Amino acid sequence: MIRDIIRMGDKRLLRVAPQVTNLGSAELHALVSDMFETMGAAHGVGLAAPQIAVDLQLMVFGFEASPEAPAVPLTALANAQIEPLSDEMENGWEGCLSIPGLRAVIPRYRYIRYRGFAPDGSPIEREAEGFHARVVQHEYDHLVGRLYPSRIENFDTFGFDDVLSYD
Ligand code: NA
After folding, report:
1. 149, 123 in Cβ contact below 8 A?
2. Is 43 annotated among the ligand-binding residues?
3. Maximum distance among all alpha carbons in the chain?
4. Which of these, 120, 90, 104, lies nearest to 160 by C-alpha position?
5. Separation of 133 CA from ligand 1 center, angstroms?
């Protein structure tokens, strides 16, 4: 079932989510399925459970075709933990389905490792770089009640997607 995506300004996006504790369950499988369906209908590349008002450490992401590549594998990741693999930052465009019509340039770590669990309870640990790593950092911030405007450094880059002409 496609779920409503709540928009920036909803206080539910500002919560620190608790962990998923029903790995392998039918309930978590149904939630994940709704999340992939919801992310697909909105044409997202990532979606975090709090954006559908579900207070849990859970995200989905990935795609073949969306600008970007090597396309990230479709992944559902519970209880994600991230760490940078270098201090190197890279700027790149981010927009949010909870922030429709907008985007800004945001610095993110270029290289990370993320760990958590697939919805069947098997562990996931991967190194990622570039767009893949950016997506995961963006969704991870949702799970700690943080949205991308609070990461903007150059406000000349922030505006509506159909009007920005920043290089
Ligand atoms: Na908060």
Report:
1. no
2. no
3. 46
4. 104
5. 23
